[PDB]
Amino acid sequence: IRTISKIELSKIHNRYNLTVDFFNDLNVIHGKNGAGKSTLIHVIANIVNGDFIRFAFLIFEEIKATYSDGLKIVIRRDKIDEQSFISVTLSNGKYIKFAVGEAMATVREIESMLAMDIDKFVKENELQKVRASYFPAFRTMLEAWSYNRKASAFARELFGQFLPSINYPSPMEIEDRLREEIRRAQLGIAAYESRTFSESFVKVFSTGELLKEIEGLAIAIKNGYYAEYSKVYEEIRSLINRSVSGALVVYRDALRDRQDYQEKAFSEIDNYMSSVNSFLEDKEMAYDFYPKVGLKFPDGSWSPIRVLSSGERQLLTMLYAASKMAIVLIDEPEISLHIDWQEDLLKRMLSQLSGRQIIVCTHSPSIATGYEDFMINISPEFI
Amino acid sequence: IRTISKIELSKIHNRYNLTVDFFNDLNVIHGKNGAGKSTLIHVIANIVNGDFIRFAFLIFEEIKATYSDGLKIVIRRDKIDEQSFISVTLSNGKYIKFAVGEAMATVREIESMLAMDIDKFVKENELQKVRASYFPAFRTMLEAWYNRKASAFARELFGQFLPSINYPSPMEIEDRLREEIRRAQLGIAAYESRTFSESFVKVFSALTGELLKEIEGLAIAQSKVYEEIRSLINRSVSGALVVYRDALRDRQDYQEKAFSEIDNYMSSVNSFLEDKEMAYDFDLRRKYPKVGLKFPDGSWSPIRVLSSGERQLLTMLYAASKMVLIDEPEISLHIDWQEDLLKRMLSQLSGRQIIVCTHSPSIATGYEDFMINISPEFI
Amino acid sequence: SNMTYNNVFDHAYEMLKENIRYDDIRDTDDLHDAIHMAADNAVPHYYADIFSVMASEGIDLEFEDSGLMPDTKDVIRILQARIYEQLTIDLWEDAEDLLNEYLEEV
């Protein structure tokens, strides 16, 4: 759809300029500390998500960014009559101008009409069609503050008000979310079982291989929320252990559809568990049973999710928000990861994220391996 | 069943002595006001149902209670050191004693050691085997304000000797009936899916034209899978058809049995009422139950249009099914209703000791051998 | 196809508006009983329609009021009571603006 390509930064923080040519695919920005990596991500997130009010808290001159479809947003900051006046000029000629002190008053107020004006502007011009998700580099703090909404306020307090909105899970919130997903999946399986019984009763009213197939289907954990239906299926298996093929066709189809809906309702949780357990060595993450999500050692012991190290916590927070996803802006994915996981994390997340623009910023080049043709070295232009 | 056989009150209120022999059922006490009929009902309700602490608020000399099996309870109020002590001495059992002022302080605390002592005494002696229900003579006051504040409200203006008041008012039995109709509707609705789940297993376990004709006749709607089954029936395998017929017949029988509990009460009320039928209907749009009157013109009206007479019948026919001391059932009643009230209630309350106290002898027609005339022998 | 929580809440909203229009509730005191009258008729009662509603988003699976949950082992009645509690909680947000719209109606 629309992918940022040419982004030009003029005199950001009143000290340096920058010009970045992006691709629609993965972009591995490699630079040492001080190259303005995370200011480029804050600028891109505030431009794409439509939070132009945050641009009142940055001291710049001209921030013009061109998308892939030709559309270009130019943000200008001027000082007229000792008042900082900032204008968002589009390529259609419709430009919204607003005062920095008015924006500051608005921000303090929320903790309105100006924000409504910005919202109306971006809405009528469709400037928020494609959203951007920001994976912050300070995501270890999000565990300490336990998506929540006060975390954005705290991070703006200790980072400045230019920071975009933060919606990133913590290694304690993912546990709760997974428990909810398991319970809801059970409820959906029970709903499908009740609907299957209601349709089957009227349907069944209306060949040893069929009996064979029925025995194989009923021989096989992942059970519905209603225990009476589990007793029904166990009674079916016992009757299997203990012409008329028209009813048997409906019975076989009901059992096959029961197993298929059981596998379909657990698709996301099994995909996330497989993606996590591909990384882990001598340790496995599972949800074996009240639902309970934890870690299963190969010795058979069961331990909670507190016991994971820093790298495993980073993989849990990173692979979960990648699944629940647009443009993904990842800041520093190499925190507390050794070389073997750094050489494969980008490949695993690209398996998770397909058809979306990926912009990552790294200090170690071990993230950039396997996709080394997409590296964009960055050097600020000091003035 | 330890029914009350004989109650002997000696110098009750320091005024009179009374000795009444009771039958096993239908004790119809007839006497004019001023003879302590209520005083006797409150004594029985404070003996049979436990709660001996109410005897601390009563002035008496000696109270002896005899059950049917032979258990004797003797209660005395004796003062020695200017403080009255209640002595509850059971037959062939332990006796408990307590200070009157201590019990008054325990009751005023509620505005628990003695309460625990009384509970231990009545539990280790098993004094709460049979519970007697009390129907007060001031049920219009209960209509004015089941309810738990009503006991304290009535004890405020009738003294603390008054027993626990558990009696349903009108506009409360409407809520009880609406809740019961809704719960029975939910029971039928859950039994539909339970029948589906059970019949799935039973048809899988199972593997004449008269049976098919019976299944086609038994098809009805109360979702619409039975309509499709009837359509297929209109257009070896005997066992599954037998299972189908049994499931449909059991569904119909449960449909009748769910509403039988309220239809009995509706027939009991509509036996008395004339030119008005009390019934329930479900709305065409929202399917919510309405409970109220149904005039022969087809007009509907709330249960507030009912007269005091009909309201006494509502409060007395209800709480008789939900199961005995009835005080003054002749209040605001027609002479024919006074004649027929005991005959209607004896079918629904059979098997328990029914003590009634009436001022009008019209209540005791047809049961004149049970009419025990009370007489207070003033000291 | 399936019944979600939002369809049940819309049905409860329509029933509460109808109750306000018919019974002429003027203040919050009558609406305190009208909200229960509207809520207890919007709970599903056919098993399938209860599990499908509980499996949808917007409604949690725990009782904030432990006393509202009945003390019984029937799971489906527990879920119906949970639906009723969540319906009352969500209708208390819209009760004020429904009262204001009724006041502006006359």
Ligand SMILES: Nc1ncnc2c1ncn2[C@@H]1O[C@H](COP(=O)(O)OP(=O)(O)OP(=O)(O)O)[C@@H](O)[C@H]1O
């Ligand atoms: N609020 C600010 N005001 C003024 N100058 C700033 C401000 N924030 C950053 N800078 C300057 O811009 C430079 C770029 O730092 P920035 O915050 O963009 O991250 P970075 O050093 O590239 O690292 P990382 O991407 O890991 O956060 C800083 O070294 C500093 O000189």
Ligand SMILES: Nc1ncnc2c1ncn2[C@@H]1O[C@H](COP(=O)(O)OP(=O)(O)OP(=O)(O)O)[C@@H](O)[C@H]1O
């Ligand atoms: N708390 C009390 N203290 C002293 N005397 C009382 C007390 N309660 C009732 N009495 C006396 O008991 C006698 C009858 O009281 P009670 O109201 O029980 O009898 P009743 O006329 O048969 O009642 P009812 O017809 O309402 O059943 C009267 O002489 C009355 O003064």
